[PDB]
Structure formats: structure tokens, C-alpha cells
Amino acid sequence: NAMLYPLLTKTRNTYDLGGIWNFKLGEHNPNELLPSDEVMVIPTSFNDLMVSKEKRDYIGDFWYEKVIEVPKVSEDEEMVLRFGSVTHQAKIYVDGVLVGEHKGGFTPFEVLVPECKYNNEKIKVSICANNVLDYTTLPVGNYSEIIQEDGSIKKKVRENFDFFNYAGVHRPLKLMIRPKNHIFDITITSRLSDDLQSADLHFLVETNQKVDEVRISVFDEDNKLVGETKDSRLFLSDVHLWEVLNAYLYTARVEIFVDNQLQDVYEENFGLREIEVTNGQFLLNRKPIYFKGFGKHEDTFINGRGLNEAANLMDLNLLKDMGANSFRTSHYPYSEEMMRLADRMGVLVIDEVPAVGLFQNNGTWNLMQTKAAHEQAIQELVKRDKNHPSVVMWVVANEPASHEAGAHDYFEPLVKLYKDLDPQKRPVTLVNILMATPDRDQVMDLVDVVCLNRYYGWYVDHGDLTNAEVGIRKELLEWQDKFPDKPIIITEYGADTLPGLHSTWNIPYTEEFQCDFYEMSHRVFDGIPNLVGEQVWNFADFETNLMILRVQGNHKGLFSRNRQPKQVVKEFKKRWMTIPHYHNKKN
């Protein structure tokens, strides 16, 4: 119900509630006043702000509480609390009274403030956040409890994924004043003409009550009116297409009227671009695209998984400079701010739900109770991002046990849910793990694009690039042979590389070996006609939990965690600026 990005309009007052909140790790009664003994920032992960390991490793309920002054609310208006996200679970309280809940730490949700408080001077907002992950949540965790022999139970979450379980309120919290009779949702679809000069637009505006008129004004990038409609349909000539690294955005100003007066107004951006997957190719605007980019992470020093718009722009500027053109929201939906940035900069985005960890240590599909959370995640993501021209593909899961029995039955309705909910019917994919090699895999028949995470030379044939090349070329041909019409994209491939580590003997973990690894990989990729994309793992080093294979987090980044480059960055820029975005390898 809150998939529309929060705006300041003539009918919508949007206030930011970010800043210092009273904080507590542990139990709390929302009817009681949380003291200011401990405080916390919104938005940010709380973890790296804790000095001790004990508090940084906390699992369970943790509270945010602050008294907010009530703004003027008219009779025909309603006041809601719009969360960008709360990680992972949340129960929201107003004056000690439960007013909303949400499960899933990477999707936005709104909560209605009771009308009986609109004339009060202040309201106390309490946020009960929860970072527990188990077999019912996305992402998947291994939950356990141990008795401290002190009388209390201590919770632990052994992650089923390769990234640190950062938690907290990671995205902006807004106090929204909006009309009771308001615009609920906007869907924008287009059919491009045969000459790509015209477009048949369709605006599906959802309301909660009914209005006499639904007016839509369309403006270009010069803020010039180019179209008007009251019947949810509009034809437009002299269109400017949204292009890769050359974006063009229109704005649809939607106005609803009752008795000839404005009830609510909203502005939704959109881009004109065509997507089609056919004949082992990914077509953008009817031209073959070669994906060049990164698997990423919402990860930065200090803030952790918290929003940092400066980081987004810095990352995307580096992406553009290297000659790259895309990235994947691994392994969870990123902030709306990032998606809007990608729209504005013309960066292709592979959108992904938090479906990572669907893998036992078998009998995975008798153990995974994630169906409910998986369906909601797909519902929320599509509803939130369906209008983004940057979003070009959906991901049902990252490295699930797609070789075990019951896998095909699990994913078929989920792939279908993507196809049913997305009005653009964009391609959906499943990110494949090495254990699910062509013969054993039983799910890749459901998707439109084959996405592979392969580490020949790092995990398999470690430090053995000679035999790694034989292995990767062998399997890529197997995939291409099993699905002759499906395009292939490498979504993950890389090697842990610590800055400063050097050698003349192609030694793993050194900067030179990272260069050698990618050079070999690309030699193989360029020989596969159906391979239409390469996305490295990762853009930058990121935090993980404690595992012997992890040398203080993950170091497969091309850049360090401070966005400083490694040796391999210079090499990628040469390759990526040589290969055009529109690149046909069928010739």
C-alpha cells in the first residue's frame, strides 16, 4: 500500500523523522518511557556503531523511541508513518498502542496513525525492530537458542548467506500527511511504435475511493507539456527513448478531482524503452545488449547497510567511468533512491528479492518454510519498482538448492508470480550455484535468462588457472547446449584480493592474481556466443560474519571498501571501454 515514493506535493506534506532516537537492545514496554541512556541514528545499521562484540552480535528485539510533534492535520486528511525499510521485522507503536507490523527487512511499508491523536500536541513513536532470521524468513538464517546457565536465553543467527547480518532502520522514515481520498498506486506501460518514434501509453491509476476525473499531464525533460488525458490512455509523438548510459525521463503528473476540485496530486517518472529476450540475446530497444558491471551490496564503512546516497552516486560514477553499464541488487532490493538514480543515469538494473540461503547445510524443500515470505517479497518488489526503466530483469533466488527434489515445484509459481504482477512482463531469472551444474539442475527451464555464479580458479581449481579455463569453458558449452535459445549472464565471478599483496608467481589473494583470473575468464566468455553479460563479484569489498574462509569480510571487490581501486580496475576499464553497450556476438 506504500509502494509510491514519498513526495512533497500540493496535497501531500512529507516530513523526515531521521535523527537521534532513544535506543535499547532488549526488552521494553512501549507504554513506558524509553530513557536516553542509549541513542541511535536513523537511518543506519546499529552494528558497527557498537564498540563491543557482544552488543554488535545482538540478536532479538531492539527499540527506537522518540516523541514527535503533531503537525496540522485537516478533517479530510490522514497521517501515516512511511518506513523505507526496517531490518528485519518490525512492530510499530503510537503512544504504546500497536498500529502496524511488517516482515521483511528490505521493502517499504506504511502505518496509519490513529485519527484520535490528530488533535494531540505530541505522539510517542516506538519502533520494535527484530533481526532474527530463520527458515521462515528471507534471507534464510539458522536460528538457535542456548541457556546461559544464568537463567536467560541467548539467541544466535548463523547466516545462510555470505554477508554480515546488518540490522536497524536502514532507510528514511517519513511522517506523511495525505488526503483520505488519495492516489493509491500508479502503473505506467507503453507500446513503442515500429519506428520507435511514437508510443501508446497506458496509465492505470488506483484510488481508494472514487473521483469524478483522473487527469494525467505528461512533461518532458524541459518540463514542457507533451500530452494530456482523462481516459487513462495517451498517444505521444516525437518520443525520446531511455538509453543505456543515456537516460531520458518523462514525468506523469496525476491529478484526481471530485466535484471539480483537486483531491490529490502525484508525480511519477517513467522511461520509454523496449525489452525482449529471444534467440540467445538480450534486446534493449531492439538492439543486442552486452551486460558489463557488478554484483553489488548496500555496504559501506560506519553505516553498514544503511542508506548513503553519496555512496550510490560515487559508485555509479565509477561504474560509468569504467565503461560498465549495469549492476544487480544482490541480494535484496536496494533503496528506492538507488533505483531512481539508476533511472536518471541510464544504468541497467537486475532487480532481486532477498531469496538467498534457500540451501540446506539435504531435503531443502521440506525444510524451507519461506513460501509466504517469498511471495510477499515478489509482490512488494514488483509493486515498488515496476515503473523503473532501469529495472530490466527480475531474480527469483540467488544460489538456491535447485538440484534437489521439489525445487521445480517451489519456483514455478514464484516465477509465475513475477510474470503475472509485472505489467511489462520483463524477463525473470534464477541465479545458479556451482552444485547445480546443467545435468542436475531442474529449475533453469522456468527462467528466461541463465545466470551463473562461477568461480573456476578460486573455489574450484584454486590458483590453477590452466585447469580452471578447461573447466569453465566446458560447463558454459553445456549450458548453451541445454538451452540454445536462452541468453547466458555471469552474475558472479571473482577472487579475494587484499590490497598490498603482491607476487610474480600468480599467487591467490594478490592483486596480480586478480588480474590473471579475470583475463582467463574473459578469454573463455568471449568464445561463448550466447554469453551476453559479465557482472563481477564484487564491486567493492564488504562485511561478512566470522568464517575461516573470510579474511575480515569479503575481498572479491574490484575496489576496496573505501572505494579505492585495486590493480584490476585499470584492466577492466580497458576491456569495458573497448566493448560497446550494444554489442552483438552472433555477428
Pick between residue 274 and residue 512 the one whose CB is nearest to a copy of itself.
512
Catalytic (active site) residue 228: no
Within positions 530 to 569, which residues make up the interface with a copy of itself, using CB under 8 A? 546-549, 551-552
Cβ–Cβ under 8 Å, residues 350 and 393: yes
Q: Is 213 annotated as a binding residue?
A: no
Query: For 408, how many CA atoms within 13 A lie in the half-sphere containing its CB?
Result: 9
Which residues make Cβ contacts (< 8 Å) with residue 46, sequence separation at least 6? 23, 40, 62, 167, 168
Which residues make Cβ contacts (< 8 Å) with residue 149, sequence separation at least 6? none
Q: Which does 472 bind (CB under 5 to 8 A by kind): a copy of itself, Mg ion, none?
A: Mg ion
Within positions 459 to 488, which residues make up the interface with a copy of itself, using CB under 8 A? 459, 462-464
- Using CB atoms, what's the residue nearest to Mg ion? 456
Q: Is 53 annotated as a binding residue?
A: no
CA distance 513 to 534: 19
Q: Is 464 annotated as a binding residue?
A: no
Pick between residue 51 and residue 310 the one whose CB is nearest to a copy of itself.
51
- Which of 268, 492, 534, 543 is catalytic? The answer is 492
Structural element, H or E, at residue 266:
strand 261-270
Per-residue contact flags (x/-) with a copy of itself for residues 504 to 523, judged by CB under 8 A: xxxxxxx-------------
Task: Tell whether residue 501 is a contact of a copy of itself (CB under 8 A).
Answer: yes
Q: Is 162 annotated as a binding residue?
A: yes
Q: How far is CA 499 from CA 451, 494, 504, 507, 564, in A?
A: 29, 15, 15, 13, 10
CA distance 66 to 372: 32
Q: Which does 456 bind (CB under 5 to 8 A by kind): a copy of itself, Mg ion, none?
A: Mg ion
Contact residues for Mg ion, defined by CB under 5 A: 308, 454, 456, 472, 493, 526
Q: Is 556 annotated as a binding residue?
A: yes
CA distance 543 to 564: 16
- Which of 77, 399, 404, 543 is catalytic? The answer is 399
Q: Can you say whether the dihedral through the CA atoms of 27, 29, 32, 34 is positive or negative?
A: positive
Per-residue contact flags (x/-) with a copy of itself for residues 30 to 59, judged by CB under 8 A: ---------------------xxx--x---
CA terminus-to-terminus distance, the chain? 47
Q: How far is the CB of 457 from a copy of itself (least distance, A)?
A: 11
Q: How far is the CB of 24 from a copy of itself (least distance, A)?
A: 20
Pick between residue 158 and residue 574 the one whose CB is nearest to a copy of itself.
158
Q: How far is CA 413 from CA 140, 230, 393, 418, 420, in A?
A: 20, 36, 17, 9, 10
DSSP class of residue 364 equals H
Cβ–Cβ under 8 Å, residues 19 and 75: no
Q: Is 537 annotated as a binding residue?
A: yes
Binding a copy of itself (rule: CB under 8 A), the pick from 361, 500, 578, 587 is 500
Q: Is 453 annotated as a binding residue?
A: yes
Alpha helices in 448-579 (DSSP H): 465-482, 511-525, 568-576
Count of residues interacting with a copy of itself (CB under 8 A): 26
Q: Which does 578 bind (CB under 5 to 8 A by kind): a copy of itself, Mg ion, none?
A: none
CA distance 71 to 122: 9
Instruction: Using only the alpha carbons of the chain, give its radius of gyration.
Output: 24
Catalytic (active site) residue 399: yes
Give the other-Cβ count within 10 Å of 228's Cβ. Answer: 11
- For 32, left (φ over 0), alpha (ψ -120 to 50), or beta? beta
Stretch of residues binding a copy of itself (CB under 8 A), selected from 270-278, 339-347, 493-501, 525-533: 493-501
Task: Tell whether residue 235 is a contact of a copy of itself (CB under 8 A).
Answer: no
Q: Which does 130 bind (CB under 5 to 8 A by kind): Mg ion, a copy of itself, none?
A: none
Binding site residues, a copy of itself, CB under 8 A: 51-53, 56, 458-459, 462-464, 498, 500-501, 503-510, 546-549, 551-552
> Which residues are the active-site residues?
399, 492
**Binding site for D-glucuronate: residue ranges?**
162, 398, 453, 459, 492, 537, 556
- Residues making up the binding site: 162, 398, 453, 459, 492, 537, 556
